[PDB]
Every structure is written in structure tokens, then in C-alpha cells.
Design a protein around this ligand. Structure first.
Ligand SMILES: [Zn+2]
Length: 76
């Protein structure tokens, strides 16, 4: 609803958003597509924050991000 750009942790989502990471449809802010399981996990895994705008959550999907790591071999 009337919310603003806020970045919080997964454990904070569990309480505020009141649904677990796995269920909660968070989009990649670069793709506008939802995050898969590991992609949601990567943010909590690598200790990133999820970004809310107007009560809509967004993050970054590993689809782009995993491959954004240069020290990942040319296979995937
Ligand atoms: Zn993406």
C-alpha cells in the first residue's frame, strides 16, 4: 500500500510481510520477474536485503546475478 523504498532482511520479511521467503513473490528489480527458490535464498545466503516499494518486494534473481560473477566458469 502506502509504503516506500525500504531494504530489509529475509527474517524481517517473515515477520513484516508475514510470509516466508519461499512463498512470497518477490521480483527481480532488473527483470520484473519473480525469483526462483535459490534466487530468494542467495539474498539471505549472501546477506543482502530485499527492497520494498509500495508494499511490493523486489530483489535480484540469480539468473542475472549468478552469471554477473566473473569467477564462475563459462558453463553456466
Ligand atoms: Zn534478474
Amino acid at each position: 500500500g502506502s509504503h516506500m523504498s525500504r531494504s530489509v532482511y529475509g527474517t524481517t520479511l517473515e515477520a513484516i510481510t508475514k510470509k516466508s521467503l519461499y512463498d512470497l513473490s518477490i521480483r527481480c528489480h532488473r527483470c520484473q520477474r519473480p525469483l526462483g527458490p535459490e534466487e530468494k535464498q542467495k539474498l539471505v545466503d549472501e546477506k543482502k536485503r530485499f527492497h520494498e516499494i509500495a508494499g511490493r518486494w523486489t530483489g535480484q534473481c540469480a539468473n542475472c546475478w549468478q552469471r554477473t560473477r566473473q569467477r564462475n566458469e563459462t558453463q553456466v
